[PDB]
Structure 1
Amino acid sequence: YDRGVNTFSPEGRLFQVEYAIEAIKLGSTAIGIQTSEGVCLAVEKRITSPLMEPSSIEKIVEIDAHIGCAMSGLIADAKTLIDKARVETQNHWFTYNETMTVESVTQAVSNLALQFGEEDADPGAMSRPFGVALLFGGVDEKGPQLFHMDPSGTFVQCDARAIGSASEGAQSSLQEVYHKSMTLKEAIKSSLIILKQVMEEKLNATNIELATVQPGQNFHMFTKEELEEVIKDI
């Protein structure tokens, strides 16, 4: 009835990491699109009440000045991963006088993604896997790269991935409208077109937040009142 945190299934996969995979679609959706001139991100805030201030809920958290992130799942669990990724980027800059590649910081944040233990030592080591999937986007040295991380620690490169509750619907709607030769405004318009029918509420300039990382502009722009330029076109 009750088994340990490290237990293999009779069919052989696992018995706790697949439950963390099952907790992914209880969160909000997040779409990241990589294009040859920049990496665009978008997310759903999923407001509940008008009394809640909408600017408090953040999903797009920057790690380095050239690297973004996007969440799906339990935000409090992913805060530790984002803080650790910030620590690794600053340590690698301090010890090597150059910026991290986004693959290296994804590897550094995925090394400790599967480290739960009961027999293990330390001052309270993780007892359960983190229940988040993270999207990273950046322009390190080969240009625009987008990466996806899942609770099993597997990281892969994706051209245009969507995670969350309606991940399969947004993926199947992302299959047809995509090509390698497109631009950033077309990418933002297509991602907003996909996010139109996914959400159960009505879209405005306060229910979503988007962020674009380019080789030219250092951080990511498009806060409020800049979203209204592309919302009224949709």
Structure 2
Amino acid sequence: QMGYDRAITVFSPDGRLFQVEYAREAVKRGATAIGIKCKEGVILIADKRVGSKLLEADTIEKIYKIDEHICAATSGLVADARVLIDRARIEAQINRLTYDEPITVKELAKKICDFKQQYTQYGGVRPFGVSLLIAGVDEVPKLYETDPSGALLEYKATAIGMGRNAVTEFFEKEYRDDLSFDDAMVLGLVAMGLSIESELVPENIEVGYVKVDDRTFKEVSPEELKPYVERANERIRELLKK
């Protein structure tokens, strides 16, 4: 400590990589991003909040199209995230080049873990200070989290970002393995309303998703956002009186 944290190469006598824990606090500097997996589809809910009103919020977004049934979200450096995810766009496309068949959500996760690992290993370069939430449906719905080094944990309710700890507590209690896609959409807005610590306005949130039946990406436009948010607000206010 105070020396074995001054490079990505050193270990401590506790055998921690502190540079990698620090790249991870970078994730926690960024705004909350939340994924739910249910058996009828998977949900991606990104914070799309602006902190001043002279900001234009179309590019404060997390949600990036990757493949035509793989979307993903991000938390960490904005910079790190765009270059990383652009790699992932290419990688998903390359997979279609040499096989003629869209990429699996898992393989993409393994490839993008491995990209981050060379940057953790090589001392001449810093790691990407970012985690992804990779959400898609390949034939069967999937939700992954990648860690800054390239570690892989498969989830079923998750978040990265500022609100992560609280969203983890929320799904401990609320998230059940029988929630319909509709039902789980509201529940994931209640999880976002909690972490942001007030009720939500559709302008400060963005929802994207992949359902199993449709097996497409869509993106939820602010008109198509509202019925869900309206349900959500009712309960977001109740948990602010607990």
Q: TM-score, normalising length from structure 2?
A: 0.88
Equivalent in the alignment of 2:170: 173
Q: Which runs of 5+ in 2 are unaligned?
A: 233-242
How much does 1:195 deviate? 1.4
SS in 2 for 1:19: helix
Letter in 2 for 1:179: R
Equivalent in the alignment of 1:183: 180
- Between the aligned partners of 2:131 and 2:107, the Cα distance in structure 1 is 17
1:101 to 96, 104, 111: 104
- Between the aligned partners of 1:145 and 1:118, the Cα distance in structure 2 is 33
SS in 2 for 1:43: strand
SS in 2 for 1:109: helix
- Between the aligned partners of 2:42 and 2:150, the Cα distance in structure 1 is 22
In structure 2, the CA distance between the partners of 1:63 and 1:56, relative to structure 1 (3 Å rule), is: same
Asked if structure 1 preserves the Cα contact closer than 8 Å seen for 2:70 and 2:137, the reply is yes
RMSD, aligned α-carbons:
1.5
Asked if structure 1 preserves the Cα contact closer than 8 Å seen for 2:46 and 2:207, the reply is yes
Q: TM-score, normalising length from structure 1?
A: 0.91
Equivalent in the alignment of 1:160: 157
Letter in 2 for 1:154: A
Equivalent in the alignment of 1:225: 223
1:22 to 21, 25, 42: 25
Asked if structure 1 preserves the Cα contact closer than 8 Å seen for 2:49 and 2:57, the reply is no
- Between the aligned partners of 1:205 and 1:79, the Cα distance in structure 2 is 24
- Between the aligned partners of 1:193 and 1:78, the Cα distance in structure 2 is 26
1:13 aligns with 2:24: no
Q: Which runs of 5+ in 1 are unaligned?
A: 120-126
Per-residue CA shift, 1:46-67, capped at 9, x if unaligned? Answer: 3111111112211010110010
How much does 1:114 deviate? 2.2
1:43 aligns with 2:41: no
* Structure number with higher helix proportion: 2
Asked if structure 2 preserves the Cα contact closer than 8 Å seen for 1:6 and 1:15, the reply is no
Per-residue CA shift, 1:9-45, capped at 9, x if unaligned? Answer: 1211113112112222111101101111100111212
1:77 aligns with 2:80: yes
Structure 1: 4+ residue segments shifted above 4 A: none
Judge which range, 35-44 or 80-89, deviates more: 80-89
Letter in 2 for 1:33: I
Asked if structure 2 preserves the Cα contact closer than 8 Å seen for 1:64 and 1:89, the reply is yes
1:134 aligns with 2:132: yes
Letter in 2 for 1:35: C
* Structure number with higher strand proportion: 2
- Between the aligned partners of 1:15 and 1:50, the Cα distance in structure 2 is 37
